């Protein structure tokens, strides 16, 4: 109960939330059902509309009006946005040529340029070009400011998870807003777009920008707008707050639009009905820019025009029904739509079996427009596992499709022609970024980047120190005219040993055999030089990766490759090698098929052994530097060292071998040489961070050899591919992946065919950023290059998406 009988007189859109049951006049009151009796009358005036006309100029002030054309309105902070255009012969912002904003041009009392986040729901990236004719204000922002061709949302590509990511720099798995709809098993509560539950603070983790600012003495406008407050009233409230006295004025503001999303759902992303909502968004941008020009703030404020996700064509008849696949369909709860999440209908039911559910959903129809996953097997790039509100069973739905439990759910629980939510690499889910202002660059295009990076940049823009987040601070420095944040490489924590030859062969009892006793003053000196790192400049092109945690490891040099060998994990943390465009593929000689050789640099005690592999009927082994790519038959012996060996399921060995035998060589051909860094990853608790030794859940039978959950590779070349990778003067080009190390290939429905019909497809699905690899390994790459550190950070956040 609210004593809703107090008044909003004087307090319209007050910035501090008053405590109950003293009635409210802020933005959230409509939704809390707690507005004072007179809120509508005083605070949501509409009389005379939103525009000045000739006959209103120099009028006598009438307080009932929605906005004002009286002579006193500039001082009072409440003119209609077009006031000066109509009554003072001024021009609209959009009709002024753009001029570089070299320095902030702010009124006295502004301690820093304000930041305005103009946020648009469902604004697909291609609207910038396709809708350009009807969006002149937005097109001016875009061409005069800094813009990306598109911005990558987070998964799922829904509204709430993406807005809260914008505000916190965090993956949904970390901030808690894992879907537009969610069920928490501990709260026994469901969170929904509609209703009151969403307002409880227990759902909302991390630290959003308005709180970061408040805690560091920067005041903030509301980010949440009530649906029922019209857009012209949100613009006018922002411009009013901007006329408050210096001690009361916020430095950060947000404007939110439910369009074009709302129409996109009804009409599809390019329906003819979509032209008008783009015109309307444009007009709102013109209002804000006209209002800012009135207050002399249009060369002082930094504006961000940003979307939360795009919009795809999705209709009723493109629905897959779980009832066509399962028979026990009434035992599950499905969160339906452009993604699937499945859990038991009852927790008091012990019969429920995820393995049986997954099995009934895998490769059952030729055309199947979804693919089931245990959450921990989803591509690592989606970062969508480490939260109790994310169900163990996930369905990645094909773009343009929906998943539903039963047909009754679709005709009784067509209406819609668009939707979003799909994998965040899908073109049609991409969205927009433009920054315009004194702190942004002038007329600059930047590469596509992810929305998890903006929190750091908005903190920079406001002189704030960011709460810890998943952005890579520095990676967007190239957006900004003037920096504030100077990144530095993390310090190496463990330094390597460099062992020489310390062990005689007979000290090893590893149960290994090799046919290698088939053996000069010229090339006895050479192989000794190789073992001391003579070729190391060739194979380690960017310096050794730094180990950022406490551990014990050895650098091992060879003719063809270099490695960092973990004495703790009994295998390399990283193996580095260069394959030039000219290099040849050869095969494993018959006599060397089961060859594994003890490494005289590394004790028996810190080595793997062949016997464990013999005994483990599930687990075989592969090599990190491939024998196939040896530079000489003599160099090929180095690849069979026990220290180059790693545990691999035979199912996995199919993928791995195809990558090593066919794809490295193809990439080296196409890219003019490639450098490859490969290694294992341990993430048993699926938190996207490297596992400590005591977190490992699986070992090769009867040994201390831990089993990787994933295998990575980082493949680097020269962006100017007329230069060879090993002699590149300028910017680098990278693609990487993190392959799940799985004992079957159930993920790939064509896996019974030749590897050439399915392996590359899998590897594309599991494309990764270097930065994802870094979190997963505790390593830091590219420490010695000629590139600036900012550029290197951009490079480490790059994701190769394989879309067209």
Ligand X SMILES: *[C@@H]1O[C@H](CO)[C@@H](O[C@@H]2O[C@H](CO)[C@@H](O[C@@H]3O[C@H](CO[C@H]4O[C@H](CO[C@H]5O[C@H](CO)[C@@H](O)[C@H](O)[C@@H]5O)[C@@H](O)[C@H](O[C@H]5O[C@H](CO)[C@@H](O)[C@H](O)[C@@H]5O[C@H]5O[C@H](CO)[C@@H](O)[C@H](O)[C@@H]5O)[C@@H]4O)[C@@H](O)[C@H](O[C@H]4O[C@H](CO)[C@@H](O)[C@H](O)[C@@H]4O[C@H]4O[C@H](CO)[C@@H](O)[C@H](O)[C@@H]4O)[C@@H]3O)[C@H](O)[C@H]2NC(C)=O)[C@H](O)[C@H]1NC(C)=O
Q: Are 543 and 785 in contact (CB under 8 A)?
A: yes
In Å, the largest CA–CA distance within the chain is 105
Query: What is the C-alpha to C-alpha distance for residues 773 and 380, in angstroms, rounded to an integer?
Result: 9
Scanning residues 364 to 383, which ones bind ligand X (CB under 6 A)? 383
Q: CA angle 194-279-226, nearest 5°? A: 25
What are the backbone dihedrals phi and psi of residue 670, each rounded to the nearest 5 degrees, phi first?
-70, -30
Using the contact rule CB under 6 A, the part of the chain among 299-307, 462-470, 610-618, 630-638 near ligand X is 462-470
**Is 284 a residue that touches ligand XVQ (CB under 6 A)?**
no
**Is 206 a residue that touches ligand X (CB under 6 A)?**
yes
CB closer to Zn ion out of 431 and 717? 431
- Is 4 tagged catalytic? no
Scanning residues 254 to 283, which ones bind ligand XVQ (CB under 6 A)? 254, 256
**Is 398 a residue that touches Ca ion (CB under 5 A)?**
no
Choose the one of K ion, ligand X, ligand XVQ, none that binds residue 658, judging by a C-beta under 5 to 8 angstroms depending on kind. Answer: none
> Within 414-555, where are the H helices?
454-461, 522-531, 536-539
Query: What is the C-alpha to C-alpha distance for residues 345 and 349, in angstroms, rounded to an integer?
Result: 8
CB closer to Cl ion out of 68 and 394? 394
Binder among 45, 198, 406, 527 for ligand XVQ (CB under 6 A): 198
Using the contact rule CB under 5 A, the part of the chain among 92-100, 431-439, 641-649, 677-685 near Ca ion is 677-685
Q: In the β-sheet with 332-335, what is the strand arrangement from edge to edge?
A: 332-335, 339-344, 393-397, 370-374
Tokens representing residue 708 in the block: 């990787």
Choose the one of Ca ion, K ion, Zn ion, none that binds residue 683, judging by a C-beta under 5 to 8 angstroms depending on kind. Answer: Ca ion
Binder among 119, 338, 767, 777 for ligand XVQ (CB under 6 A): 119
Helix (H), strand (E), coil (C) string for 273-322: HHHHHHHHHHHHHHHHHHHHHHCCCCCCCEEEEEECCCCEECCCCCEEEH
We find the least distance from the C-beta atom of residue 740 to ligand XVQ, in angstroms, to be 32
**Is 225 a residue that touches ligand XVQ (CB under 6 A)?**
yes
Query: What is the C-alpha to C-alpha distance for residues 277 and 124, in angstroms, rounded to an integer?
Result: 13
Choose the one of ligand X, ligand XVQ, K ion, none that binds residue 616, judging by a C-beta under 5 to 8 angstroms depending on kind. Answer: K ion
Scanning residues 157 to 186, which ones bind Cl ion (CB under 5 A)? 179-181
717 Cβ contact partners less than 8 Å away, ≥ 6 residues apart: 667, 671, 672, 673, 674, 675, 725, 728, 732, 733, 734
Query: What is the C-alpha to C-alpha distance for residues 194 and 480, in angstroms, rounded to an integer?
Result: 38
We find the least distance from the C-beta atom of residue 569 to Ca ion, in angstroms, to be 14
Binding-site positions: 121, 159, 180, 261, 265, 308-309, 420, 683, 685, 687, 689, 691
We find the least distance from the C-beta atom of residue 548 to ligand X, in angstroms, to be 13
Tokens representing residue 404 in the block: 């539903």
Binder among 81, 212, 319, 387 for ligand X (CB under 6 A): 387
CB closer to ligand X out of 420 and 473? 473
Binder among 311, 342, 467, 610 for ligand X (CB under 6 A): 467
CB closer to ligand X out of 305 and 686? 686
Using the contact rule CB under 5 A, the part of the chain among 238-246, 261-269, 499-507, 655-663 near Zn ion is 261-269
**Is 469 a residue that touches ligand X (CB under 6 A)?**
yes
- For residues 204-239, one letter each, b for 16 or more C-beta atoms within 10 angstroms of the residue's C-beta and e for the rest, the string is bebbbbbebbeeeebbbbbbebbeebebbbbbbbbb
* Catalytic option among 81, 146, 157, 159: 159
**Is 455 a residue that touches ligand XVQ (CB under 6 A)?**
no
Interacting residues toward ligand X by CB under 6 A: 170-171, 173-176, 205-206, 383, 386-387, 467-470, 688-689, 775
- The residues annotated with a catalytic role in the active site are 159
């Amino acid at each position: 109960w609210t004593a809703t009988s107090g008044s909003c007189k004087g307090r319209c859109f007050e910035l501090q939330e008053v405590g109950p049951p003293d009635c409210r006049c802020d933005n959230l009151c409509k939704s809390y059902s707690s507005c004072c009796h007179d809120f509508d009358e005083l605070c949501l005036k509409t009389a005379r509309g939103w525009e000045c006309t000739k006959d209103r100029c120099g009028e006598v002030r009438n307080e009932e009006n929605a906005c004002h054309c009286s002579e006193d309105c500039l001082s009072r902070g409440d003119c209609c946005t077009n006031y000066q255009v109509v009554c003072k012969g001024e021009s609209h912002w959009v009709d002024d040529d753009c001029e570089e904003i070299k320095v902030p041009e702010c009124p006295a009392g502004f301690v820093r340029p304000p930041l305005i986040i103009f946020s648009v729901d469902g604004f697909r990236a291609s609207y910038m070009k396709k809708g350009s004719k009807v969006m002149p204000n937005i097109e001016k922002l875009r061409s005069c400011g800094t813009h990306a061709p598109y911005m990558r949302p987070v998964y799922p590509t829904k509204t709430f998870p993406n807005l809260y990511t914008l505000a916190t720099g965090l993956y949904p798995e970390s901030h808690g807003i894992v879907g537009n709809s969610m069920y928490d098993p501990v709260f026994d509560a469901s969170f929904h777009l509609r209703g009151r539950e969403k307002f409880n603070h227990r759902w909302w983790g991390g630290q959003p920008l308005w709180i970061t600012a408040t805690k560091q003495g920067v005041r903030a406008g509301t980010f949440f707008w009530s649906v029922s407050i019209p857009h012209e009233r949100r613009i006018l409230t922002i411009l009013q707050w901007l006329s408050l006295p210096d001690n009361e004025r916020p430095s950060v503001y947000a404007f939110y639009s439910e369009q074009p999303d709302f129409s996109g759902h009804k009409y599809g992303p390019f329906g003819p009905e979509m032209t008008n909502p783009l015109r309307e968004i444009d007009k709102t941008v013109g209002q804000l820019m006209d209002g800012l020009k009135q207050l002399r703030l249009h060369r002082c404020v930094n504006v961000i025009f940003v979307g939360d996700h795009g919009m795809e064509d999705v209709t009723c008849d493109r629905t897959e029904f779980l009832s066509n696949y399962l028979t026990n369909v009434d035992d599950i709860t499905l969160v339906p739509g452009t993604l699937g999440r499945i859990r038991a209908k009852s927790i008091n039911n012990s019969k429920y079996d995820p393995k049986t559910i997954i099995a009934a959903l895998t490769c059952k129809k030729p055309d199947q427009h979804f693919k089931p996953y245990m959450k921990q097997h989803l591509p690592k790039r989606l970062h969508y596992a480490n939260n109790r509100r994310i169900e163990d069973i996930h369905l990645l739905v094909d773009r343009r499709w929906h998943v539903a439990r039963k047909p009754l759910d679709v005709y009784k629980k067509c209406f819609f022609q668009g939707d979003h939510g799909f994998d965040n690499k899908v073109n049609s889910m991409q969205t927009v970024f433009v920054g315009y202002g004194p702190t942004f660059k002038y007329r600059t295009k930047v590469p596509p980047f992810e929305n998890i990076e903006l929190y750091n940049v908005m903190c920079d823009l406001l002189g704030l120190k960011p709460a810890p987040n998943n952005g890579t601070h520095g990676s967007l420095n190239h957006l900004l005219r003037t920096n504030t944040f100077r990144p530095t490489m993390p310090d190496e924590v463990s330094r390597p040993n460099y062992p020489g030859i310390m062990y005689l062969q007979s000290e090893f009892d590893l149960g290994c055999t090799c046919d290698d006793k088939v053996e000069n003053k010229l090339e006895e000196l050479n192989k000794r030089l190789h073992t001391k790192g003579s070729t190391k400049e060739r194979h380690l092109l960017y310096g050794r990766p730094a180990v950022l945690y406490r551990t014990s490891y050895d650098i091992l040099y060879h003719t063809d490759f270099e490695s960092g060998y973990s004495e703790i994990f009994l295998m390399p943390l990283w193996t580095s090698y260069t394959i030039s465009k000219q290099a040849e593929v050869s095969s494993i000689p018959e006599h060397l098929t089961n060859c594994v050789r003890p490494d005289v640099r590394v004790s028996p005690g810190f080595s793997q052994n062949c016997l464990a592999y013999k005994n483990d009927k599930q687990m075989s082994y592969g090599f990190l530097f491939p024998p196939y790519l040896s530079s000489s038959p003599e160099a090929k012996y180095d690849a069979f060292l026990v220290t180059n060996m790693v545990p691999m399921y035979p199912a996995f060995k199919r993928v791995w071998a195809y990558f090593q035998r066919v794809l490295v060589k193809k990439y080296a051909s196409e890219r003019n040489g490639v450098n490859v860094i490969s290694g294992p990853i341990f993430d048993y608790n699926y938190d996207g961070l490297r596992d400590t030794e005591d977190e490992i859940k699986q070992y090769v039978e009867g040994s201390s050899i831990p089993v990787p959950t994933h295998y990575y590779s980082i493949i680097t070349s020269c962006l100017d591919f007329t230069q060879p990778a090993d002699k590149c003067d300028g910017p680098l080009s990278v693609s990487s992946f993190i392959l799940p190390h799985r004992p079957d290939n159930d993920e790939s429905c064509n896996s019974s065919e030749d590897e050439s019909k399915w392996v590359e497809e899998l590897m594309k699905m599991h494309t990764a950023r270097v930065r994802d690899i870094e979190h997963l390994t505790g390593l830091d790459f590219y420490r010695k290059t000629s590139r600036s550190y900012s550029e290197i950070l951009t490079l480490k956040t790059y994701l190769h998406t394989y879309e067209s």
